[PDB]
């Protein structure tokens with residue numbers, strides 16, 4: 001009788017964290033509760049009760065016990081390892097492990113969209129990626145995102161997908177649904193942990209062809225299929241040139257076919273990689289989200305909708321009252337994810353804090369040769385972005401400084417004086 005498989009538990013520099021692998025609700029644990037539950041996980045609730053006996057009498061474990069995180073299924077040196085680990089995290093002052101691992105088994109894509117900066121990139125077997133997958137699993141990764149490139153075009157994709165299902169890792173795969181094999185679709189429809197995400201900009205045939213170079217027919221078909229087989233599905237769109245009418249048009253489609261979740265990502269140009277010109281900014285993206293959410297609730301639709309992108313909080317001057325006190329975890333969870341909450345691995349094995357680091361000319365460590373935990377500790381790229389601090393007047397007066405530090409790190413280092421330059425994305 002230990003901790004539920006549906007729950008993620010990790011030791012952190014401030015004790016520990018609990019996260020639902022479904023509801024995604026979270027609770028910050030202290031050192032006592034963290035060590036208690038760490039034993040509850042490795043030696044059952046009984047042996048855990050033996051230790052901390054005085055604590056239970058002092059109500060120090062009252063809250064921990066009241067949690068519904070338990071299921072059915074040398075403790076001294078196990079407790080020592082816990083203490084050594086927590087101390088090391090305090091030393092490096094980093095989070096335990098990324099919560100999101102993004103993998104790019106292949107960079108090749110059958111399409112070449114204009115809002116894409118990974119188009120035309122032109123691979124290792126799933127056996128290797130399986131090894132990398134185990135490290136993430138055993139180190140406490142919350143979810144794995146499979147991208148590219150068209151991952152359904154990755155030859156060993158079926159094996160990779162199976163490995164994810166077997167390792168019991170919450171996983172998503174993003175596809176254009178153009179040339180996906182029948183074997184691949186079957187694995188997804190019967191999968192319990194893997195969730196497909198469909199790249200679809202609009203139902204309008206003409207516009208989508210301009211944006212993706214294809215009609216939306218095959219994405220629409222695959223979306224309708226999963227609703228039949230009862231498999232959860234998601235739609236992903238980049239806010240480029242769509243009008244509000246074409247957006248709501250796609251909202252209804254998700255409502256009709258019971259799409260699990262619909263996301264609209266902000267669009268960021270990349271000089272020399274993206275052909276399409278940016279029409280809307282983060283302010284416009286906010287108005288859109290406020291528009292869609294009303295339409296969905298005004299129709300009483302159970303559609304999980306959201307907007308996505310970095311520095312989206314810059315479009316809400318209402319907040320940032322300079323009174324925002326962030327918890328030790330929130331201070332590293334919100335904002336730039338490249339710092340503490342995510343990792344990205346390229347097709348050649350190169351490890352990156354973010355995909356944006358691709359265009360950065362600095363040596364990277366290889367995942368097919370070094371351990372993900374070792375890199376997570378001593379990597380120059382992570383240390384660079386983790387330790388960076390802005391000296392901008394407006395930023396230093398800003399409430400969100402800790403999670404932003406004057407905008408996206410990758411953009412700032414390109415400037416003459418990164419420490420003083422504020423990203424144009426923010427106009428506050």
Ligand code: SF4
Pocket residue numbers: 109110111112113115116117118119148149150176199212
């Ligand atoms: S389908 Fe996805 S990866 Fe392929 S070109 Fe378009 S955006 Fe880029």
Ligand code: SF4
Pocket residue numbers: 310336337338339354355356407408409410
């Ligand atoms: S480095 Fe830039 S693009 Fe990457 S997550 Fe952080 S803020 Fe966003």
Ligand code: SF4
Pocket residue numbers: 314394395396398399400401404405406407422423426427428
């Ligand atoms: S760039 Fe500076 S002012 Fe703008 S949101 Fe980030 S820290 Fe606050």
